[PDB]
């Protein structure tokens, strides 16, 4: 039809992203590109929250090392706005559980960029995830 709203892009992405994280995290690396930044919580050895990895291969290695098993997500709010170069910035707030452990509240930030070769196709340029209990 026309050009999709940033909110439509963000909502569709949140659905696809967390559905894939539940069903096949081994395929989650497909969302990213060569310059993509990725951090998903974590507390480093005797200190602050962890750092971030770059590139689809290293991102796949990180996702594999996190051993996502039967991931469950309850999304409570999604914000999506137009940003630089027809990109979309997404703010997600929700609850996430891994390995059938208790749900933990989280705050995620995404930057989706036009993939550039297929119309209305985006890739994840930035993925900043944080459990708030590790922070507060």
């Amino acid at each position: 039809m026309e050009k999709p709203s940033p909110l439509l892009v963000g909502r569709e992405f949140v659905r696809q992203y967390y559905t894939l994280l539940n069903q096949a995290p081994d395929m989650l690396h497909r969302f990213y590109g060569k310059n993509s930044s990725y951090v998903h919580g974590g507390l480093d050895s005797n200190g602050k929250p962890a750092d971030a990895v770059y590139g689809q291969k290293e991102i796949h290695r990180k996702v594999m090392s996190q051993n996502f098993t039967n991931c469950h997500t309850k999304i409570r709010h999604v914000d999506a706005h137009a940003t630089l170069n027809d990109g979309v910035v997404v703010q997600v707030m929700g609850l996430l559980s891994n390995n059938n452990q208790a749900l933990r509240r989280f705050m995620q930030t995404f930057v989706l960029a036009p993939e550039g070769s297929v119309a209305n196709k985006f890739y994840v340029h930035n993925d900043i995830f944080r459990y708030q209990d590790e922070v507060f």
């Binding site: 039809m1 026309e2 050009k3 999709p4 439509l8 892009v9 569709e12 992405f13 696809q16 992203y17 497909r30 969302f31 990213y32 590109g33 060569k34 993509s36 689809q56 989706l112 993939e115 550039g116 070769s117 297929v118 209305n120 196709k121 985006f122 890739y123 994840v124």
Partner: peptide
């Protein structure tokens, strides 16, 4: 519209 996701690979 049809919105898809994936890296440029």
């Amino acid at each position: 519209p049809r919105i898809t996701f994936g890296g440029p690979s």
